[PDB]
Amino acid sequence: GSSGSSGILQSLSALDFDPYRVLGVSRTASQADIKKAYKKLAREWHPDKNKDPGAEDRFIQISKAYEILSNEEKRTNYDHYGSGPSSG
């Protein structure tokens, strides 16, 4: 059996890009999992060692994804909105 698998599943994001999806974690992930995942991604995908064109892009995002969660104020805000339409 050379190959055989399927995973047809649609999706819909609330904002330009989701933080959890960027960092690569789920709701179950807590400040701990997210944090470690952030630094780990920032260090590994760090532009300091990365020379190939594009690496930076990823990093710039990875940092942004966490910036939201990492921050208490930012994190909470999201929850309040419940991934819905902003008041204004």
PDB file of C-alpha atoms in Angstrom:
ATOM      1  CA  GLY A   1       0.000   0.000   0.000  1.00  0.00           C
ATOM      2  CA  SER A   2       1.975   2.959  -1.325  1.00  0.00           C
ATOM      3  CA  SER A   3      -0.279   5.367   0.569  1.00  0.00           C
ATOM      4  CA  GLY A   4      -3.850   5.957   1.700  1.00  0.00           C
ATOM      5  CA  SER A   5      -5.298   8.613   3.994  1.00  0.00           C
ATOM      6  CA  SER A   6      -7.790  11.485   4.100  1.00  0.00           C
ATOM      7  CA  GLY A   7      -8.587  14.449   6.328  1.00  0.00           C
ATOM      8  CA  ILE A   8     -11.143  16.701   4.655  1.00  0.00           C
ATOM      9  CA  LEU A   9     -11.962  19.385   7.222  1.00  0.00           C
ATOM     10  CA  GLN A  10     -12.870  23.036   6.660  1.00  0.00           C
ATOM     11  CA  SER A  11     -11.856  25.887   8.964  1.00  0.00           C
ATOM     12  CA  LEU A  12     -12.465  29.583   9.630  1.00  0.00           C
ATOM     13  CA  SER A  13     -10.224  32.106  11.385  1.00  0.00           C
ATOM     14  CA  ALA A  14     -11.519  35.109  13.326  1.00  0.00           C
ATOM     15  CA  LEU A  15      -8.535  37.384  12.701  1.00  0.00           C
ATOM     16  CA  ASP A  16      -5.750  37.699  10.129  1.00  0.00           C
ATOM     17  CA  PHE A  17      -3.936  34.894  11.949  1.00  0.00           C
ATOM     18  CA  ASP A  18      -4.465  32.870  15.126  1.00  0.00           C
ATOM     19  CA  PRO A  19      -1.814  32.809  17.885  1.00  0.00           C
ATOM     20  CA  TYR A  20      -2.325  29.202  18.977  1.00  0.00           C
ATOM     21  CA  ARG A  21      -2.081  28.065  15.356  1.00  0.00           C
ATOM     22  CA  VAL A  22       1.105  30.078  14.832  1.00  0.00           C
ATOM     23  CA  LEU A  23       2.936  28.847  17.931  1.00  0.00           C
ATOM     24  CA  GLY A  24       1.547  25.373  17.313  1.00  0.00           C
ATOM     25  CA  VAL A  25      -0.466  24.779  20.476  1.00  0.00           C
ATOM     26  CA  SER A  26      -4.065  24.138  21.524  1.00  0.00           C
ATOM     27  CA  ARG A  27      -6.434  25.537  24.150  1.00  0.00           C
ATOM     28  CA  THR A  28      -5.143  22.870  26.537  1.00  0.00           C
ATOM     29  CA  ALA A  29      -1.786  24.642  26.319  1.00  0.00           C
ATOM     30  CA  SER A  30      -1.172  26.929  29.296  1.00  0.00           C
ATOM     31  CA  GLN A  31       1.203  29.850  29.834  1.00  0.00           C
ATOM     32  CA  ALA A  32       3.739  27.087  30.469  1.00  0.00           C
ATOM     33  CA  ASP A  33       3.271  25.093  27.264  1.00  0.00           C
ATOM     34  CA  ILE A  34       2.852  28.289  25.244  1.00  0.00           C
ATOM     35  CA  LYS A  35       5.891  29.964  26.800  1.00  0.00           C
ATOM     36  CA  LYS A  36       8.226  27.010  26.261  1.00  0.00           C
ATOM     37  CA  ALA A  37       6.815  26.610  22.752  1.00  0.00           C
ATOM     38  CA  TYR A  38       7.428  30.297  22.050  1.00  0.00           C
ATOM     39  CA  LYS A  39      11.043  30.551  23.204  1.00  0.00           C
ATOM     40  CA  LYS A  40      11.747  27.159  21.634  1.00  0.00           C
ATOM     41  CA  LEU A  41      10.414  28.375  18.285  1.00  0.00           C
ATOM     42  CA  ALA A  42      12.106  31.765  18.603  1.00  0.00           C
ATOM     43  CA  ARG A  43      15.437  30.148  19.470  1.00  0.00           C
ATOM     44  CA  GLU A  44      15.211  27.424  16.824  1.00  0.00           C
ATOM     45  CA  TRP A  45      13.699  29.586  14.084  1.00  0.00           C
ATOM     46  CA  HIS A  46      15.869  32.457  15.317  1.00  0.00           C
ATOM     47  CA  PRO A  47      17.226  34.659  12.495  1.00  0.00           C
ATOM     48  CA  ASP A  48      20.598  34.721  14.253  1.00  0.00           C
ATOM     49  CA  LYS A  49      21.400  31.225  12.987  1.00  0.00           C
ATOM     50  CA  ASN A  50      18.868  31.141  10.149  1.00  0.00           C
ATOM     51  CA  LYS A  51      20.371  32.420   6.898  1.00  0.00           C
ATOM     52  CA  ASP A  52      17.850  31.086   4.380  1.00  0.00           C
ATOM     53  CA  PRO A  53      15.425  33.691   2.976  1.00  0.00           C
ATOM     54  CA  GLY A  54      12.132  33.549   4.850  1.00  0.00           C
ATOM     55  CA  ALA A  55      13.208  32.371   8.295  1.00  0.00           C
ATOM     56  CA  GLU A  56      12.819  35.891   9.683  1.00  0.00           C
ATOM     57  CA  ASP A  57       9.186  36.088   8.572  1.00  0.00           C
ATOM     58  CA  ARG A  58       8.338  33.028  10.666  1.00  0.00           C
ATOM     59  CA  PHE A  59      10.148  34.420  13.709  1.00  0.00           C
ATOM     60  CA  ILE A  60       8.467  37.820  13.434  1.00  0.00           C
ATOM     61  CA  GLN A  61       5.136  35.986  13.560  1.00  0.00           C
ATOM     62  CA  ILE A  62       6.018  33.434  16.238  1.00  0.00           C
ATOM     63  CA  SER A  63       6.845  36.349  18.537  1.00  0.00           C
ATOM     64  CA  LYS A  64       3.576  38.100  17.696  1.00  0.00           C
ATOM     65  CA  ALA A  65       1.496  34.983  18.350  1.00  0.00           C
ATOM     66  CA  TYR A  66       2.887  34.731  21.881  1.00  0.00           C
ATOM     67  CA  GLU A  67       2.832  38.490  22.457  1.00  0.00           C
ATOM     68  CA  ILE A  68      -0.952  38.139  22.614  1.00  0.00           C
ATOM     69  CA  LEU A  69      -1.236  35.114  24.902  1.00  0.00           C
ATOM     70  CA  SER A  70       1.960  35.737  26.867  1.00  0.00           C
ATOM     71  CA  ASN A  71       0.487  39.093  27.887  1.00  0.00           C
ATOM     72  CA  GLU A  72      -2.258  38.852  30.509  1.00  0.00           C
ATOM     73  CA  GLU A  73      -4.168  41.897  29.264  1.00  0.00           C
ATOM     74  CA  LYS A  74      -3.889  40.817  25.627  1.00  0.00           C
ATOM     75  CA  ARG A  75      -4.765  37.202  26.422  1.00  0.00           C
ATOM     76  CA  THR A  76      -7.843  38.074  28.480  1.00  0.00           C
ATOM     77  CA  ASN A  77      -9.146  40.486  25.844  1.00  0.00           C
ATOM     78  CA  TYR A  78      -9.296  37.680  23.281  1.00  0.00           C
ATOM     79  CA  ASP A  79     -11.261  35.457  25.660  1.00  0.00           C
ATOM     80  CA  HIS A  80     -13.751  38.245  26.367  1.00  0.00           C
ATOM     81  CA  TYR A  81     -14.426  38.509  22.633  1.00  0.00           C
ATOM     82  CA  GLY A  82     -14.737  34.732  22.499  1.00  0.00           C
ATOM     83  CA  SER A  83     -13.322  34.742  18.976  1.00  0.00           C
ATOM     84  CA  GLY A  84     -16.200  36.911  17.800  1.00  0.00           C
ATOM     85  CA  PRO A  85     -16.890  40.297  16.170  1.00  0.00           C
ATOM     86  CA  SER A  86     -15.262  43.267  17.901  1.00  0.00           C
ATOM     87  CA  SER A  87     -17.614  45.807  19.475  1.00  0.00           C
ATOM     88  CA  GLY A  88     -16.214  48.563  17.280  1.00  0.00           C
TER      89      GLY A  88
END
